[PDB]
Amino acid sequence: QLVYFSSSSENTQRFIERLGLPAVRIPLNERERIQVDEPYILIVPSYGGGGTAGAVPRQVIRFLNDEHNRALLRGVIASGNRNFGEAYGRAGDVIARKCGVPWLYRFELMGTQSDIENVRKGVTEFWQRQP
Amino acid sequence: QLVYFSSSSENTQRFIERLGLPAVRIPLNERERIQVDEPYILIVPSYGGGGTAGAVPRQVIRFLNDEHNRALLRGVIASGNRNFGEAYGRAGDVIARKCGVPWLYRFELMGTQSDIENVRKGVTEFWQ
Amino acid sequence: ISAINWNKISDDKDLEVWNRLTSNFWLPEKVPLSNDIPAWQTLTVVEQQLTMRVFTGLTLLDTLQNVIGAPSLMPDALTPHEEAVLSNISFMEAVHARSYSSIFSTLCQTKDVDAAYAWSEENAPLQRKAQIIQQHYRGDDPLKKKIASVFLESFLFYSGFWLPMYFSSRGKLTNTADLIRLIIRDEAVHGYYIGYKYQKNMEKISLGQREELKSFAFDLLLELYDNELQYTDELYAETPWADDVKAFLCYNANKALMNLGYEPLFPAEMAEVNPAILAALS
Amino acid sequence: ISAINWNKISDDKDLEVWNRLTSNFWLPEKVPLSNDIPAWQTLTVVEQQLTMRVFTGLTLLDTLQNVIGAPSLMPDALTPHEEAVLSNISFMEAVHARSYSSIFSTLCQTKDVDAAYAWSEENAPLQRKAQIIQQHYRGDDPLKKKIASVFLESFLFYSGFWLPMYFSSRGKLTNTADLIRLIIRDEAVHGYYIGYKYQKNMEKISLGQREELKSFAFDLLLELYDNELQYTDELYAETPWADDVKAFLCYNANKALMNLGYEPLFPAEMAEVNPAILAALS
Ligand SMILES: Cc1cc2nc3c(=O)[nH]c(=O)nc-3n(C[C@H](O)[C@H](O)[C@H](O)COP(=O)(O)O)c2cc1C
Ligand SMILES: Cc1cc2nc3c(=O)[nH]c(=O)nc-3n(C[C@H](O)[C@H](O)[C@H](O)COP(=O)(O)O)c2cc1C
Ligand SMILES: [Mn+2]
Ligand SMILES: [Mn+2]
Ligand SMILES: [Mn+2]
Ligand SMILES: [Mn+2]
Questions:
Q1: CA closest to D271 among chain A residues
Q2: Which residues of D are catalytic?
Q3: Which residue ranges does UniProt annotate as crossing the membrane (chain A)?
Q4: Annotated active-site positions of C, please?
Q5: CA distance D60 to D64
Q6: Rounded CA gap, A121 and A131, in Å?
Q7: Where are the alpha helices (DSSP H) in chain D?
């Protein structure tokens, strides 16, 4: 399974659509929170820094610091833009280090065809090497 | 006597014109230079800092580091704008310390009638 | 359109002002406004209400400067570098406007802020001022636009700026005062530069046309002045400060005139400002 | 004119982008460009000429963005906060254009710089590119202006941006590369926000019109692309680098498309950037 966040600009949403895999969206509305039942990879865009100063969107922080959800986190994929330099995909690095999970992939905006193919292959292989 | 500088915006020039006292202008053109033969008060605008950082215009520095000119300096009046806060009239302060002469007066832009009146009175009493 | 070349400056003043304005860049986030909360609490309801009404008024006028004011000057630019400087000026008007919201966010209650905004919409002097200024910005006379702009922000704004300067002298809201001083530093340079360009534009019109414009400038001045006295009455109604504000307006009116190259209009007696207010400025 | 209230945000993206763009404020004086003089001196005459021709070209286009591009978007703003953000964008285009002059002043000979400006004036693909973009900025279709703006600076500029990134990968002109990365960081956000607004604007129109704009956008993309291959050919003619430049162009074209909400069009084969160039970015 997959969990993702996408802001109102919906680049990560557009990626998930084209990916073709079942996924659950962390609600855009900050007051709404969701619970997941199974192991998952998290896909999140980087947002340092406009509405939070921090790399990870508030909604994802809210989702993660519920230890129920955190315990089922198995990996992270981050999106963003290479033009941000060292900060490119920062959300993935931050989540990975804090939660003790691997940073699996890093892509730009809505993702290229290569990104889609790589992530499709990567995820299938990831669950093959998972309990 | 009076020595002054005014940039292309001519605020200090207009003060001098309305003061009505005899005065010599440090050339706007940086390549030209002048000398004076009698003791004077200097009136200078502040310009920290549109690419030079220094509050004293380059033309005034060139005028002052002539030994003959510097020796005849006796006092400084600074123009500027109160809206620059602590930096209001900063050029007079810099010149006052560097040259060891008193900073005599502070005024804004082309000067009010009060400024003209105050300087007229101050100048006469200073030389006596 | 031709590539701008900053190594071929036509008027030195363009570079000088470009450098002064850009190197003075600030944002309201850089001012520790939260350190004013205890001071805000000690202010009376009437003082608090005054502060919010003052700043909602300034928000309207800085918004006007950003959206219409500075852009309206762009077709009348003498050089490509002036056009660029006007781009900075416009953006900094948005920063000025934004900063009042910063004050509201930190210090004030939403409902009261919204009431102050509502009071501003309804205040006849405020709206008349905006209307008069906008009318000249939308006109076909480039020189009258410059006069209006210099009058708005080197003169009219000072009915509003008086208050944080007063608080500063009493050792209250010192951080809000520091924020306002940043705005005032920008506006001093804006007024200087626009007034400078006004005088440059005037060099290319006839002597008769200059006298006509001089008369217009003093007419507009007195019309705006009369309006601002009424705005001041209504703003400072439940305080003893009106006369002091009016003296500060005359003092600033004189500087605005000097920015345009005209001699001060108001005699010392009308422009005698409380020394603590002057000290708050510098 | 209404008074802007930053505590009543209609679209959170306006505040996010305002914060990102203003907190990223920079000036070329903040970069120690003079430290590139040794590196500059080690470049071949071919490399030096190429560098100056690149930057004179970018100067023209950033001037276009400041004087016409960004202002052309202002009347089509959905919110007052967007108007304010667009004021920042316009000012930063002035900063971008100014920074090329900073480079020239620090590193180059005036005669060579003026010859590069002349070369740019007479370069057909460059002038055709400038003509096409401003034709759309002068048109009556707000949505086509946004398309052209995104294509210019999230796509076409990268034929130029390639060069400092390449030099960076070799340990030469590293400070100039640092400056270009500041421009690139701005443009990434400019393209994102303008493209975001383009999509918001399209929510309000018929399917038929959306399909028309899609067809127009892809045809404009291919028109500009083919023109840019010619520009690249002429710019990089004395070097072996045209193919890598073109791959970097295709890579960025895909990003420009995605900013507009369209899927990337250029296959992996065409957009395969040398890892050292990608490393120079991040
Ligand atoms: C305010 C702001 C800050 C951003 N910061 C970063 C960043 O630090 N690193 C990065 O790779 N991308 C950054 N981005 C780019 C976004 O992560 C990227 O556009 C992403 O596709 C947005 O996804 P979404 O539309 O699903 O919300 C930033 C974008 C914005 C608007
Ligand atoms: C770029 C710039 C920087 C300035 N800096 C200061 C300053 O630091 N302190 C001050 O009191 N006035 C400052 N001023 C205001 C001028 O000193 C003032 O307008 C003066 O009247 C100019 O005189 P002039 O027109 O004869 O050159 C500055 C003006 C400019 C344009
Ligand atoms: Mn302002
Ligand atoms: Mn202003
Ligand atoms: Mn740009
Ligand atoms: Mn741009």
A1: A112
A2: 100
A3: none
A4: 100
A5: 6
A6: 18
A7: 12-23, 37-42, 45-64, 70-73, 80-107, 110-122, 124-137, 142-151, 158-169, 174-202, 207-235, 242-259, 275-281
B30: tokens are 């940086």
CA torsion sign for A6, A10, A11, A17 is positive
Element (H, E) at B120: helix B113-126
The CA distance from D88 to C244, in Å, is 37
Q: Residue B26 corresponds to which amino acid? A: I
Q: Are A93 and A78 in contact (CB under 8 A)?
A: yes
Do residues C133 and C223 make contact, with C-beta atoms less than 8 angstroms apart?
no
> Which letter does DSSP use for residue D263 in this model?
P
Pocket of ligand 2 (CB under 6 A): B 6-7, 9-13, 45-48, 50, 55, 79-81, 84, 87-90, 109; C 16-17, 20, 192
- Which of these, C161, C135, C163, lies nearest to C223 by C-alpha position? C135
CB proximity list for A15: less than 8 A, separation 6 or greater: A43, A79, A107, A110, A111, A115, A116
* Three-state secondary structure call for residue D268: coil
Helix axes C242-259, C158-169, angle to 10 degrees: 120
Contacts of residue B2, defined as CB under 8 A and 6 or more positions apart, other chains included, come to: B16, B19, B21, B22, B23, B24, B40, B41, B42, B43, B123
Cβ pair B50:C16 closer than 8 A = yes
Tokens 């439940």 — which residue? Answer: C238
C190 CA → ligand 3 middle, Å:
8
User: How many domains in chain A?
Assistant: 1
Residue holding tokens 């002064």?
C20
Reduce the DSSP state of residue D64 to 3 states and report it.
Answer: helix
Which CATH number goes with the domain that contains A21? Answer: 3.40.50.360
The 3-class secondary structure across A63-122, one letter per residue, is HHCCHHHHHHEEEEEEEECHHHHHHCCHHHHHHHHHHCCCEEEEEECCCCHHHHHHHHHH
Q: What is the 3-state secondary structure (H, E, C) of chain C?
A: CCCCCCCCCCCHHHHHHHHHHHHCCCCHHHCCHHHHHHHHHHCCHHHHHHHHHHHHHHHHHHHHHHHHHHHHHHHHCCCHHHHHHHHHHHHHHHHHHHHHHHHHHHHCCHHHHHHHHHHHHHCHHHHHHHHHHHHHHCCCCHHHHHHHHHHHHHHHCHHHHHHHHHHHHCCCCHHHHHHHHHHHHHHHHHHHHHHHHHHHHHCCCCHHHHHHHHHHHHHHHHHHHHHHHHHHHHHCCCCCCHHHHHHHHHHHHHHHHHHCCCCCCCCCCCCCCCHHHHHHHC
What's the domain count of chain D? 1
Domain span including residue A71: 1-131
- CB within 8 A of C35, min separation 6: which ones? C174, C175
C98 to D66: CB separation less than 8 angstroms, yes or no: no
Q: Are A49 and D254 an interchain contact pair (Cβ–Cβ within 8 Å)?
A: no
- Experimental technique, in short, is X-ray
Residue that is written with structure tokens 């926000």 in the block: D193
Q: Which two three-digit tokens encode residue C52?
A: 């919010």
**C-beta separation of B69 from B35 below 8 A:** yes
**Calpha distance D12→A7 (Å, rounded):** 10
Query: What CATH number is associated with residue C62?
Result: 1.10.620.20
Parent domain of D204 = 1-282
Tell me the DSSP string of D197-251.
HHHHHHTTS-HHHHHHHHHHHHHHHHHHHHHHHHHHHHHSTTSS-HHHHHHHHHH
